[PDB]
Amino acid sequence: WTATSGSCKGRCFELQEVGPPDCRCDNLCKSYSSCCHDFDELCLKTARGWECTKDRCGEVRNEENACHCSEDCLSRGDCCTNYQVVCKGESHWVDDDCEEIKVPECPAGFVRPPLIIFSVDGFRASYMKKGSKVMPNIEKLRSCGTHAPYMRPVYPTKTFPNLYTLATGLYPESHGIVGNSMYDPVFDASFHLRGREKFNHRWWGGQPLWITATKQGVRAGTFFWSVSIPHERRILTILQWLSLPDNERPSVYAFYSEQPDFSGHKYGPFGPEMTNPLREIDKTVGQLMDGLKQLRLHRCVNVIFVGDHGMEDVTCDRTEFLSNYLTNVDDITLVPGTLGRIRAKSINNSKYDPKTIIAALTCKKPDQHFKPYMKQHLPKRLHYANNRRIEDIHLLVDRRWHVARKPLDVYKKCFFQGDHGFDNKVNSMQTVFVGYGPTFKYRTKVPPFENIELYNVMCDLLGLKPAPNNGTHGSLNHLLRTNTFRPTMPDEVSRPNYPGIMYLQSEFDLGCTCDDKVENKLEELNKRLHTKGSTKERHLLYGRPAVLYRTSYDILYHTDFESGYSEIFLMPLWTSYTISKQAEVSSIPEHLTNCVRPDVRVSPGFSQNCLAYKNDKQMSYGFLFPPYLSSSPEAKYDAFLVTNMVPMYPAFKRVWAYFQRVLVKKYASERNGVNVISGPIFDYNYDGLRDTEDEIKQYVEGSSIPVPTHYYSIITSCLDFTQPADKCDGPLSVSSFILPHRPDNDESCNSSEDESKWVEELMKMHTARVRDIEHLTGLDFYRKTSRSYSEILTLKTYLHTYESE
């Protein structure tokens, strides 16, 4: 119930929300059907439109007007935004040459530069160049301020997941808004774009920026605008709030536009109908900047122009139907479109088996335009699994396509020509970031970055302590003139042991064998030096990784590689080695095919054994440092140490062997040497965080050897590739992966072909940030470089995406 008989007199766009049944006058009252009877009359005035004209200049004030051109309008804070241009001979902001904003130039009584976030739905990154001729205000912001060539959204690349990620710094799996449509089986409730359930606070996790601000005594504008409020009135409302007395005036504001998304769905991303919505958004930006210039705030406010996701060409005819695959299509519920999510239609159906559904959807048609996954098997970079609202079965849909349950869903719902939602590395999904103002840099291009990083920056811009989030605070310091956040490196928690030779060969009863009983004072001291770390500077280029949790581990040195060997998990946590451009690849010699050698530095009780592998008919083993890249026949024996062995399914060994034998040398050739750090990951509860021992669900049969869920590698070289990776004076370049450790290659439909036709494709799909590996391992990399720590944080957030220009 709402008692709509109250009045909005003196309350238009009030900031504090009044509770039912009292009627409302805030910018969301329309959405709740709760506005006072006189809200339209008083708060949504439209008389005479949005612009001053010559004949209106100096007019007697008429309070009916949408905005004013009377001499008193500046003091009232309600001039039309073009008032000073039309009436006082001033220039539009866009026509002024840009001039560096070295210091905030704020009116008296301003305690900090305000922040205005100007958010645009469906604003594809390439619009900044392709539309630049029709967006002069936006082009001025971009060229004069700080901009990225694009900003990477979160998956799914839908509106509500992304706008809430922007507001909280969190992945959708953590903030809870995992789609525009959701079912929560604990609540037994459904969230939809249409209707009232979406207003219930129980859906919305984390702590969005407006709450962070309020909790720390920084006043916020209300960020949400009912759709019927015209953009011109949104801009005027912001400018009016900026005229409030100091103690009442917010410090942070948000504007939102439903365009260009609205038109992009109808016309496609580059439909000729798209030029007008881009012109109109630019015009709104110009209104805001002119309005700020009127208030003498245009060199005081920090403005962020930011999108949620891009837009791809998608038409009704490019729809895959589950009814062409499943015998039992009426037994499932599908959330459809540019991603698929599948669950049982009935929880009383005991005949429901996700395994048979996945299998029926796997590589069944030559050109199949989606791929099914159990959510834990999705690329770890998507961070899209750890939430009860994410169905166990996910379909990753190819760009330009939809999935639907049956054909009747698509014509009893072609209209549309654009959509979004796909994998967040897809070029058409990328969106925009520009920051302009005193706290941003001047005429500065920054590399692409992820939207999860912005909350921390917005907090920095407002002097707020961010709530715990998934950004890496400091990684965007290079966007900022001032207000940088200068983190300290985390403290190492576990110090390594450095074991010497402590065990005799006969103490080991591991069931292993090796043809190494082949026999010099010259070379003997030299090999002792290698075991004490004489080559470590060559192979550990950025310091040893720090272990940020409590555990027992040993540093093991060798001619060709260094490792941190876990006595708890019976295998290395990391293995580090450098491969120069000149390195040669060799075979595993015949006599060494099945060689595994006890490590006399590590007790039998803290070693793996070969017998467990012999007896486990599903599980084989691989090596972290590759025997193929040994520096000499003699050094190759180190690569067969039991302390370099890790459990690998035979199907995964196909992947791993090709990476080690072919791809590492390829990368060294291309990048002028590479440093590689490889190791296992255990994430059985798919939370993106390192498992403890008691979370491990699978072991090599009969043994205490834990089976990794993934294998990672971090591949580092010099950004200036004229310098070799091991003699790099400046910034680094990295690419990494987190490969799923799976007993089949069903993910790769072409896996019957030579690895040259499918392995690198798999690896590209499972590309990762170093930060992703840090979360999954409790390790901290790049501890000892010549580089500034914030530069290293940026490097750790880098994702190599493998998309074209």
Ligand X SMILES: *[C@@H]1O[C@H](CO)[C@@H](O[C@@H]2O[C@H](CO)[C@@H](O[C@@H]3O[C@H](CO[C@H]4O[C@H](CO)[C@@H](O)[C@H](O[C@H]5O[C@H](CO)[C@@H](O)[C@H](O)[C@@H]5O[C@H]5O[C@H](CO)[C@@H](O)[C@H](O)[C@@H]5O)[C@@H]4O)[C@@H](O)[C@H](O[C@H]4O[C@H](CO)[C@@H](O)[C@H](O)[C@@H]4O[C@H]4O[C@H](CO)[C@@H](O)[C@H](O)[C@@H]4O)[C@@H]3O)[C@H](O)[C@H]2NC(C)=O)[C@H](O)[C@H]1NC(C)=O
Ligand Y SMILES: CNC(=O)CCn1cc(CNCc2ccc(Br)cc2)c2ccccc21
Annotated binding-site residue numbers for 1-tetradecanoyl-sn-glycerol 3-phosphate: 159, 180, 261, 420
Question: Residue 395: which of Na ion, ligand X, ligand Y, none does it interact with, CB under 5 to 8 A by kind?
Answer: none
Does residue 117 touch ligand Y according to CB under 6 A? yes
Q: Which is nearer to Zn ion, 427 or 444 (CB)?
A: 427
Question: Residue 256: which of Zn ion, ligand Y, ligand X, none does it interact with, CB under 5 to 8 A by kind?
Answer: ligand Y
- Rounded distance between C-alpha atoms, residue 360 and residue 612, angstroms: 34
- Rounded to the nearest whole angstrom, what is the least distance from the CB of residue 758 to ligand Y in the complex? 39
Which residues contact Na ion by CB under 5 A?
A: 613, 616, 619, 745, 748, 751
Does residue 261 touch Zn ion according to CB under 5 A? yes
Q: CB within 8 A of 621, min separation 6: which ones?
A: 596, 613, 645, 646, 647, 648
Q: How many degrees, rounded to 5, is the angle at CA 703 between CA 697 and CA 707?
A: 40
Contact in structure between 384 and 174 (CB atoms under 8 Å)? no
Which burial class, exposed, middle or buried, applies to 687 when counting CB atoms under 10 A from its CB (0-12, 13-18, 19+)?
middle
The DSSP call for residue 337 is: B
Part in contact with ligand Y (CB under 6 A); list of ranges 122-130, 252-260, 377-385, 610-618:
252-260
- Rounded distance between C-alpha atoms, residue 634 and residue 627, angstroms: 11
In our burial notation (b when 16+ CB lie closer than 10 A, e otherwise), range 250-271 reads bbbbbbbbebbbebbbebbbbb
Part in contact with ligand Y (CB under 6 A); list of ranges 250-258, 353-361, 471-479, 618-626:
250-258
Question: Residue 110: which of ligand Y, Zn ion, Ca ion, none does it interact with, CB under 5 to 8 A by kind?
Answer: none
Question: Residue 706: which of Na ion, ligand Y, ligand X, none does it interact with, CB under 5 to 8 A by kind?
Answer: none
Of 132-171, binders to ligand Y (CB under 6 A) are 160, 163-164, 166-167
The residue nearest ligand X at its CB is 205
Residue located via tokens 């000149």: 582
The residue nearest Zn ion at its CB is 261
- Rounded to the nearest whole angstrom, what is the least distance from the CB of residue 615 to Na ion in the complex? 7
Q: Which is nearer to Na ion, 222 or 751 (CB)?
A: 751
Question: Residue 387: which of ligand X, Ca ion, ligand Y, none does it interact with, CB under 5 to 8 A by kind?
Answer: ligand X
Does residue 227 touch ligand Y according to CB under 6 A? yes
- Rounded distance between C-alpha atoms, residue 156 and residue 167, angstroms: 16
Q: Which string of DSSP letters, residue by residue, matches 484-529?
A: ---PPPPPP-BPPB---S---GGG---S---------HHHHHHHHH
Q: Which is nearer to Zn ion, 124 or 441 (CB)?
A: 124
Q: Which is nearer to ligand X, 409 or 687 (CB)?
A: 687
Q: Which is nearer to Na ion, 49 or 650 (CB)?
A: 650
Does residue 199 touch ligand Y according to CB under 6 A? no
Which residues contact ligand X by CB under 6 A?
A: 170-171, 173-176, 205-206, 383, 386-388, 468-470, 687-689, 775
Q: Which is nearer to Ca ion, 284 or 709 (CB)?
A: 709
- Report the side by side order of strands in the sheet with 674-681: 553-557, 562-566, 571-579, 674-681, 710-718, 732-740, 767-768
- Rounded distance between C-alpha atoms, residue 640 and residue 454, angstroms: 46
Q: Which is nearer to Na ion, 36 or 612 (CB)?
A: 612
Residue located via tokens 């996954």: 373
**What is the separation of C-alpha 793 from the centre of its chain, rounded to a whole number of angstroms?**
14
Does residue 453 touch Zn ion according to CB under 5 A? no
Q: Give which of 512, 521, 517, 311 is closest to 427, Cα–Cα.
A: 311
* One residue of 17, 51, 90, 258 binding ligand Y per CB under 6 A: 258
Question: Residue 174: which of Na ion, Zn ion, Ca ion, none does it interact with, CB under 5 to 8 A by kind?
Answer: none
Q: Which is nearer to Ca ion, 234 or 381 (CB)?
A: 381
Q: Is the peptide bond before 250 cis (omega within 30 degrees of 0)?
A: no
Does residue 312 touch Zn ion according to CB under 5 A? no
- Rounded distance between C-alpha atoms, residue 100 and residue 459, angstroms: 23
Q: Which string of DSSP letters, residue by residue, matches 235-284?
A: HHHHHHHTTS-GGG--SEEEEEEEEEHHHHHHH-TT-GGGHHHHHHHHHH
Q: CB within 8 A of 507, min separation 6: which ones?
A: 604
Q: What is the dihedral of CA 739, 513, 586, 709, to 10 degrees?
A: 0
Q: Give which of 576, 553, 567, 659 is closest to 606, Cα–Cα.
A: 567
SS3 content of the chain, % helix, strand, coil (to 5): 30, 20, 50
Catalytic residues: 159
Which residues contribute to the annotated binding site?
A: 121, 159, 180, 261, 265, 308-309, 420, 683, 685, 687, 689, 691
Question: Residue 728: which of Zn ion, ligand X, Na ion, none does it interact with, CB under 5 to 8 A by kind?
Answer: none
- Rounded to the nearest whole angstrom, what is the least distance from the CB of residue 491 to Zn ion in the complex? 45
Does residue 256 touch ligand Y according to CB under 6 A? yes
What is the H or E stretch that residue 733 is in?
strand 732-740
Contact in structure between 135 and 282 (CB atoms under 8 Å)? yes
Can you name the residues that pair with 302 across neighbouring β-strands? 115
Which burial class, exposed, middle or buried, applies to 715 when counting CB atoms under 10 A from its CB (0-12, 13-18, 19+)?
buried
- Rounded distance between C-alpha atoms, residue 547 and residue 601, angstroms: 21
374: left (phi > 0), else alpha (psi -120 to 50), else beta?
A: beta
- Rounded to the nearest whole angstrom, what is the least distance from the CB of residue 732 to Ca ion in the complex? 28
* One residue of 81, 119, 469, 751 binding ligand Y per CB under 6 A: 119
- Rounded to the nearest whole angstrom, what is the least distance from the CB of residue 625 to Na ion in the complex? 21
User: Dihedral sign, CA of 268, 270, 271, 274?
Assistant: positive
Question: Residue 224: which of Na ion, ligand Y, Ca ion, none does it interact with, CB under 5 to 8 A by kind?
Answer: ligand Y
Question: Residue 386: which of ligand X, ligand Y, Zn ion, none does it interact with, CB under 5 to 8 A by kind?
Answer: ligand X
Which residues contribute to the annotated binding site for Zn(2+)?
A: 121, 159, 261, 265, 308-309, 420
- Rounded to the nearest whole angstrom, what is the least distance from the CB of residue 613 to Na ion in the complex? 5
Q: Which is nearer to ligand Y, 164 or 171 (CB)?
A: 164
- Rounded to the nearest whole angstrom, what is the least distance from the CB of residue 164 to ligand Y in the complex? 4
Question: Residue 721: which of Zn ion, ligand Y, Ca ion, none does it interact with, CB under 5 to 8 A by kind?
Answer: none
Which residues contact Ca ion by CB under 5 A?
A: 683, 685, 687, 689, 691
Q: Which is nearer to ligand Y, 204 or 625 (CB)?
A: 204
Query: Are β-strands 151-152 and 449-450 bridged in parallel, bridged antiparallel, or unpaired?
Result: parallel
The residue nearest Na ion at its CB is 751
Which residues contribute to the annotated binding site for Ca(2+)?
A: 683, 685, 687, 689, 691
- Rounded to the nearest whole angstrom, what is the least distance from the CB of residue 447 to ligand Y in the complex? 21
Q: Which is nearer to Zn ion, 337 or 724 (CB)?
A: 337
77: left (phi > 0), else alpha (psi -120 to 50), else beta?
A: left
Question: Residue 261: which of Na ion, Zn ion, ligand Y, none does it interact with, CB under 5 to 8 A by kind?
Answer: Zn ion
- Rounded distance between C-alpha atoms, residue 510 and residue 597, angstroms: 9
Q: Give which of 735, 781, 767 is closest to 382, Cα–Cα.
A: 767
Residue located via tokens 């299509």: 329
- Rounded to the nearest whole angstrom, what is the least distance from the CB of residue 146 to ligand Y in the complex? 17
- Rounded distance between C-alpha atoms, residue 466 and residue 455, angstroms: 7
Does residue 120 touch ligand Y according to CB under 6 A? no
Of 272-301, binders to ligand Y (CB under 6 A) are none
Amino acid sitting at position 412: K
- Rounded to the nearest whole angstrom, what is the least distance from the CB of residue 659 to Na ion in the complex? 17
Which residues contribute to the annotated binding site for 1-hexadecanoyl-sn-glycero-3-phosphate?
A: 159, 180, 261, 420
Under rule CB under 5 A, how many of the chain's residues touch Zn ion? 1
- Rounded to the nearest whole angstrom, what is the least distance from the CB of residue 227 to Zn ion in the complex? 13
* Chain residues in the site for ligand Y (CB under 6 A): 117, 119, 160, 163-164, 166-167, 209, 223-224, 227, 254, 256, 258
* Chain residues in the site for Zn ion (CB under 5 A): 261
